[PDB]
């Protein structure tokens, strides 16, 4: 029985629930204050985790955080994608290099041991806006640097705010992001071994 979980009431029950593999308990507190009372779950990570391949399956099970996550989703190592306590899994990390460059590839490598999960596309990512432009009373949510550069030509009150890290968002921003997200999904190429073999 895991402890760090934010287990919702629909754990195990069939629904459209989602699991947030976010980084930083500070963010998960914001989640508690923002989460849907029944649908949206979540779980905090510890941070830098070892590369998914390079060792055996029982040695996947050796790691504590991996053990907690497979217990939470119910997808125990070595079985087919069934008994999913959470219908969906989402990843959301501080977007400078802490999770994009460290946590995302490793987590995808770990989730790769079930190609059925990627085929369903149940593993997704919530894109946090890199920059926020505060105009008038209602702010805008430019989602990338290229969009900012291509859309800054005609806009008054060009007040800029960098959102480097999940901590920069306020409660309104996090509420908007969770309730109305973009949900980018994870890759699925013709070969699911070489593209992460580049990791080593």
């Amino acid at each position: 029985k895991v402890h760090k979980h934010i287990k919702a009431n629909l754990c195990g029950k069939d629904a459209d629930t989602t699991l947030f593999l976010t980084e930083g308990d500070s963010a998960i507190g914001y989640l508690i204050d923002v989460r849907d009372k029944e649908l949206h779950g979540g779980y905090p990570l510890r941070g830098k985790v070892l590369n998914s391949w390079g060792m055996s399956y029982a040695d996947m099970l050796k790691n504590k955080e991996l053990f907690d996550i497979c217990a939470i989703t119910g997808l125990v190592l070595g079985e087919k994608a069934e008994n999913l306590n959470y219908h969906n899994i989402a990843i959301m990390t501080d977007a400078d290099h802490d999770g994009l460059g460290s946590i995302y590839p490793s987590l995808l490598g770990f989730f790769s041991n079930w190609p059925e999960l990627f085929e369903q596309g149940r593993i997704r990512f919530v894109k946090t806006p890199v920059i926020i432009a505060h105009v008038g009373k209602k702010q805008e949510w430019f989602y990338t640097v290229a969009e900012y550069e291509s859309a800054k030509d005609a806009l008054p009150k060009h007040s800029i705010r960098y959102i480097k890290g999940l901590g920069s968002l306020e409660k309104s921003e996090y509420r908007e992001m969770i309730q109305n997200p973009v949900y980018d999904v994870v890759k699925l190429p013709e070969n699911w071994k070489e593209l992460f073999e580049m990791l080593m």
Binding site: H3, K4, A8, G24, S26, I32, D33, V34, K164, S168
Partner: protein
């Protein structure tokens, strides 16, 4: 090779003395006049320095609490970094002395976000309650660039709470409501019977009562079914993780209850459903004690009021009334100082304005010619006039548009206004000024 030599090993006291300096100027006891801590002094000083004219600018917490080393902080920057988030939030203070923009945590999870993903600024709650910053006495040591203690209007020690543990002493100043402290200070200005200020925890809707005089705090339980209830609140010193793990998880492990996490946006929501293997007694008084005993809804407490005074000495106060009285006694003199200095400055300002008006009306009248004076003979002849000679340079730095009637009649009226304002400052007293300052805070 000048060899002076004495066999005085007692100089080893310079160690203890230095250690004394390491245990006197770097203590954890707050200061009664300003309500700060040694770390918070440097943090707020750096925030004020960085804010400058554009106080609305959000400075990074790393820049706020990492550049305090040159201000005279003989400790690691980590203490400043962590103390910049346990004071700038809103879940732990009835008076946030530093507004923030980011994930500063809440009572659900008492943890800040990071070192650099958040921002801080000197809040608007600091300028209305910390007037006369530049009159704080300077520290005995030079390296302490921030003053010994700022000068607030109401004692910040009482508000926002504080919990420190020094060598042989412990302070656990409970937070008090802003209205209670303001009323107490206002009524103690006029020397009436002091009303003890109440206790109001931040983001707390439960109950706080002093049945034994220990200032205990209790939450609220609300039964919804024969075997369910909706815990609306729990005692303050509880976050989700520690509460669960320490008390509620073992209770479930005893095979008694099962909890449904319903922690809403407004406090905790730990609803619980019992099972067969429990009392669930009747009569509404034994189940009362059981419901607030098993789930830890009752918290005992005590007030240890120990704090440093205006000087370096540390005193312990039995009740907050004495603290209020002494703080207002000190602030009375520190307001009288401002009164005297304002009178002194306003007299000179009025004299300068009068001389300016005199020069402008003499020039427009043509009695003294601005032109035709060789080698700026103007200044030479003004140096031998009754009132001119004091401000000749300022009396010469007059713009062209200051000669026309627009900037002459209004200049004379402004001089008259400065005169009557000097009279107002002359006739006013400390009590009225401090009462006005007290009312200004809201």
């Amino acid at each position: 090779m000048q060899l002076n030599n004495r066999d005085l090993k007692s100089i080893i006291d310079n160690e203890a003395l230095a250690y004394a300096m390491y245990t006197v100027e770097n203590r954890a006891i707050p200061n009664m006049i300003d309500g700060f801590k040694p770390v918070q002094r440097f943090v707020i000083a750096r925030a004020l320095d960085l804010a400058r004219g554009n106080k609305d600018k959000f400075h990074k917490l790393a820049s706020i609490a990492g550049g305090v080393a040159d201000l005279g902080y003989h400790h690691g920057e980590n203490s400043a970094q962590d103390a910049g988030a346990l004071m700038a939030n809103t879940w732990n203070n009835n008076f946030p002395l530093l507004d923030g923009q980011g994930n500063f945590g809440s009572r659900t999870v008492q943890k800040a976000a990071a070192s650099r993903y958040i921002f801080a600024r000197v809040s608007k709650n600091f300028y209305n309650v910390y007037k006369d910053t530049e009159y704080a006495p300077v520290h005995q040591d030079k390296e302490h660039i921030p003053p010994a203690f700022y000068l607030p209007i109401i004692p910040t020690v009482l508000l926002n709470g504080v919990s420190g543990i020094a060598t042989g002493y412990a302070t656990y100043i409970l937070p008090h409501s802003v209205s209670s402290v303001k009323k107490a200070v206002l009524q103690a200005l006029q020397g009436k019977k002091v009303t003890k200020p109440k206790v109001e925890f931040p983001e707390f809707r439960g109950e706080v009562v002093e049945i034994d005089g220990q200032y205990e705090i209790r939450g609220t339980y609300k039964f919804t079914s024969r075997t369910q209830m909706h815990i609306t609140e729990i005692p303050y010193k509880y976050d989700r993780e520690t509460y669960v793990s320490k008390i509620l998880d073992p209770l479930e492990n005893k095979g008694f209850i099962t909890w449904d996490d319903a922690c809403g946006e407004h406090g905790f929501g730990f609803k619980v459903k019992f099972r067969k293997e429990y009392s669930l007694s009747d009569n509404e008084e034994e189940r009362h004690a059981k419901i607030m005993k098993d789930f830890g809804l009752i918290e005992r407490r005590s007030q240890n009021i120990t704090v440093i005074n205006e000087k370096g000495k540390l005193q312990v106060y039995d009740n907050v009334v004495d603290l209020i009285k002494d703080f207002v006694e000190v602030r009375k003199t520190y307001v009288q100082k401002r009164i005297d200095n304002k009178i002194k400055e306003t007299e000179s300002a009025f004299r300068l304005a009068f001389a300016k008006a005199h020069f402008i009306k003499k020039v427009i009248s043509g009695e003294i010619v601005v032109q035709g004076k060789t080698r700026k003979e103007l200044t030479e002849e003004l140096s031998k006039i009754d009132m001119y000679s004091s401000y000749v340079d300022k009396l010469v730095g007059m713009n062209i548009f200051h000669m026309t009637s627009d900037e002459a009649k209004k200049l004379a009226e402004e001089a008259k206004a400065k005169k009557e304002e000097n009279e107002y400052w002359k006739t006013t007293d400390v009590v009225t000024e401090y009462t006005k300052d007290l009312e200004e805070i809201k």
